[PDB]
Structure 1
Amino acid sequence: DRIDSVSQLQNVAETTKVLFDVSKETVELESEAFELKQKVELAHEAKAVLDS
């Protein structure tokens, strides 16, 4: 039973490699989204003000 349990560490590291990489990668790639948020807000304000 211990053998069967340890059989599952055989390839966990290979997948969790890309998992841990892309986790932080995607979490920090929202910087461009944050920079786009202010531009989108400015555009929304401009459209609203000219609608006014």
Structure 2
Amino acid sequence: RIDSVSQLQNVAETTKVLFDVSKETVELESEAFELKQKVELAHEAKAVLDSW
């Protein structure tokens, strides 16, 4: 009976760690967008220059 009750207690606490962490990673993709843009712009500049 103790085994069941303990699982609820222990599990209920720890899943919140993954719930915050996962969404933080999604926040990182907003910063990632600035990284992506820099790559686009540099590829663009490089492409024209190779043609030159």
Range class of TM-score, shorter chain: 0.7 to 0.9
Where in structure 2 are there 5+ consecutive unaligned residues?
Answer: none
The TM-score normalised by the length of structure 1 is 0.74
- Identity percentage over the alignment? 100
The answer to which structure has the higher helix fraction is 2
In the TM superposition, residue 28 of structure 1 has moved relative to its aligned partner by 1.3
RMSD of aligned Cα (Å):
1.7
Q: What number of residue pairs does the alignment pair up?
A: 51
In the TM superposition, residue 11 of structure 1 has moved relative to its aligned partner by 1.3
The TM-score normalised by the length of structure 2 is 0.74
> What is the CA–CA distance in structure 1 between the aligned matches of 2:29 and 2:23, rounded to whole Å?
11
Where in structure 1 are there 5+ consecutive unaligned residues?
Answer: none
